[PDB]
Amino acid sequence: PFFFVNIFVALIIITFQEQGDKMMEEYSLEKNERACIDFAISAKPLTR
Amino acid sequence: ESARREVESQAQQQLERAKHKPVAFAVRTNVSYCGVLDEECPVQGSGVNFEAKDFLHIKEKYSNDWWIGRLVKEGGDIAFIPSPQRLESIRLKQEQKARRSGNPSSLSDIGNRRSPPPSLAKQKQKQAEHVPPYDVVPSMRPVVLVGPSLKGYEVTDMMQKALFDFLKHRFDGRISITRVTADLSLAKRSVLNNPGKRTIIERSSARSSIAEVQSEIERIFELAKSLQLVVLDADTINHPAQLAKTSLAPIIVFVKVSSPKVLQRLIRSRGKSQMKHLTVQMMAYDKLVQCPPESFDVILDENQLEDACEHLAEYLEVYWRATH
Amino acid sequence: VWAEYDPAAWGRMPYLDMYQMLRHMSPPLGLGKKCPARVAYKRLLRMDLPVADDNTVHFNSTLMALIRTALDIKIAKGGADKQQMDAELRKEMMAIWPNLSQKTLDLLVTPHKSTDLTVGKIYAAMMIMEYYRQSKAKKLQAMREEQDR
Amino acid sequence: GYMEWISKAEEVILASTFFHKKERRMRFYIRRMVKTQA
Amino acid sequence: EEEEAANQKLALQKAKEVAEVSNQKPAKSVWEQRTSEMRKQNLLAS
Structure with missing residues (x-):
């Protein structure tokens, strides 16, 4: 209950495959930069 | 002219009938010269474009200027090699195309000091060393494999005997094994005409070990002429430069551990006996590593027995295809 | 914060208020209220935002370079490499979006047009003028301390 | 890997327990058997 | 990776003696991708 159960939870966590994306491997950086520039895409100033 | 064509056909006929005859002996080159670009060859279009550090195998007799030789490359055809006197003649032709070769410089000094060429401008001088263009080497290379640290001890001796076993078993009937119990690093050729020719002279070198070492050199030559490859179990030489300038010029095999951290524990696996000599065992290891890899012929840098076993197997397999 | 400075929030702000802006903000995106002036100008030099004819800077364009300078995205150290990397970045976005x-x-x-007046150029000039003024101030002091003997 | 190297090299050269030479060869032969896949 | 690198490096050095006669990778997990990114970012500080 304590050790082996936590082994299963750890093994699935460590080896969880990324959800699809079809493996383009044409883009260079990705990582945090992919999401950060996307925020710059849809950025709307707050309106009073 | 009919004379040149007649000797062209006679040489071609001689080459054809000598294609299946035994090899006489081999020579050593130290200059990058091509024998296909020289117009003085008896047959044009069948020269040899061989660089330095190369093997040539001469079989038959032509003249005092040219010889019929073959390359140790695979597929190499029968070509013509210049004689040592011919190379000396063509060596003199190398620096004659220059503006000046002797003492009189051409620094805006024309018609003032004619300076006819004395004996200094010929090959008579510069005889302090006078390395010959050709050296006598065994037909096929003796196999000298150097231990990772130092031969004569348990850990090193275990390294070669395993390889000694495989070369004897897999290649039985075509490989001869010989052990050089005595020294082999005293192979000199330009020391004296005959140091210690007789054992009754009671000279310093006559009663020394040089006489037996000198006699061991030609035994390796004898094993080479009978077409079987030979190895050397020399227990004294531990560095490439120790047996590199000699007339043997053999194939050097390296067995090494990847890291000294592995070697020290491998030495520990033998027992307390090697702990006394462990200190001298380590300085003898890193010295060989500091030697450039290009000095060695083949490198066994890996770990497993079987893959290292096949590494030397295919290498001399090239050497057997190459010289056949 | 950006909407707070401009209550109307049209999307354009004077370039001068950017320097006051980035100090209020915390690092890494901001500079911090304790940020030295010279370090602040050094980041602005790498940020390289063009300035509009009305002396204002756009919200979205400013946001990109602050992301650009903080994550070191395709950032060359200068020269023609800047145009090559920008074109490569443009292609990647078109491939992604x-x-x-x-x-x-x-x-x-x-x-990037050479004629365009960027924020970096404005801060480069004042630093050069400040350096020239300080260098001239030191020279006048130097020729004075050496003359009192 | 090198520990495996010397083991076969020691195997070749070697080819009360000390008193009986037939015991020394016998322990040599049984040593072969244990590593067999069977 | 080491046995692959040692394999290619050996066969190239082996090919020198032979000169006279004459990739597979499974997709990395989310844990490994982020871990590699965090390694570079922390090593960037130096």
């Missing part, structure tokens, strides 16, 4: 309008791409990735 095919529906991105060209005006938005030119608004986010500004095409």
Whole structure:
């Protein structure tokens, strides 16, 4: 209950495959930069 | 002219009938010269474009200027090699195309000091060393494999005997094994005409070990002429430069551990006996590593027995295809 | 914060208020209220935002370079490499966002004209003038301390 | 890997327990058997 | 990776003696991708 159960939870966590994306491997950086520039895409100033 | 064509056909006929005859002996080159670009060859279009550090195998007799030789490359055809006197003649032709070769410089000094060429401008001088263009080497290379640290001890001796076993078993009937119990690093050729020719002279070198070492050199030559490859179990030489300038010029095999951290524990696996000599065992290891890899012929840098076993197997397999 | 400075929040702010802005903000995106002036100008020099004719800077264009300078995205150290990397970045976004309008791409990735007056150029000049003024001030002091003997 | 190297090299050269030479060869032969896949 | 690198490096050095006669990778997990990114970012500080 304590050790082996936590082994299963750890093994699935460590080896969880990324959800699809079809493996383009044409883009260079990705990582945090992919999401950060996307925020710059849809950025709307707050309106009073 | 009919004379040149007649000797062209006679040489071609001689080459054809000598294609299946035994090899006489081999020579050593130290200059990058091509024998296909020289117009003085008896047959044009069948020269040899061989660089330095190369093997040539001469079989038959032509003249005092040219010889019929073959390359140790695979597929190499029968070509013509210049004689040592011919190379000396063509060596003199190398620096004659220059503006000046002797003492009189051409620094805006024309018609003032004619300076006819004395004996200094010929090959008579510069005889302090006078390395010959050709050296006598065994037909096929003796196999000298150097231990990772130092031969004569348990850990090193275990390294070669395993390889000694495989070369004897897999290649039985075509490989001869010989052990050089005595020294082999005293192979000199330009020391004296005959140091210690007789054992009754009671000279310093006559009663020394040089006489037996000198006699061991030609035994390796004898094993080479009978077409079987030979190895050397020399227990004294531990560095490439120790047996590199000699007339043997053999194939050097390296067995090494990847890291000294592995070697020290491998030495520990033998027992307390090697702990006394462990200190001298380590300085003898890193010295060989500091030697450039290009000095060695083949490198066994890996770990497993079987893959290292096949590494030397295919290498001399090239050497057997190459010289056949 | 950006909407707070401009209550109307049209999307354009004077370049002068940017220097006051980045100090209020915390690092890494901001500079911090304790940031030295010289370090602040050094980041602005790498940020390289063009300035509009009304002396204002766009919200989206400013946001990109602050992301650009903080994550070191395709940042060359200078020269023609800047144009090559910007063109490579433009292609990647078009490959990732095919529906991105060209005006938005030119608004986010500004095409660099040599005539354009950038924020970096403005801060480069004042630092040079400050350095020249300080160098002249030191020279006048130098020729004075050496003359009192 | 090198520990495996010397083991076969020691195997070749070697080819009360000390008193009986037939015991020394016998322990040599049984040593072969244990590593067999069977 | 080491046995692959040692394999290619050996067969190239082996090919020198032979000169006279004459990639597979499974997709990395989310844990490994982020871990590699965090390694570079922390090593960037130096």
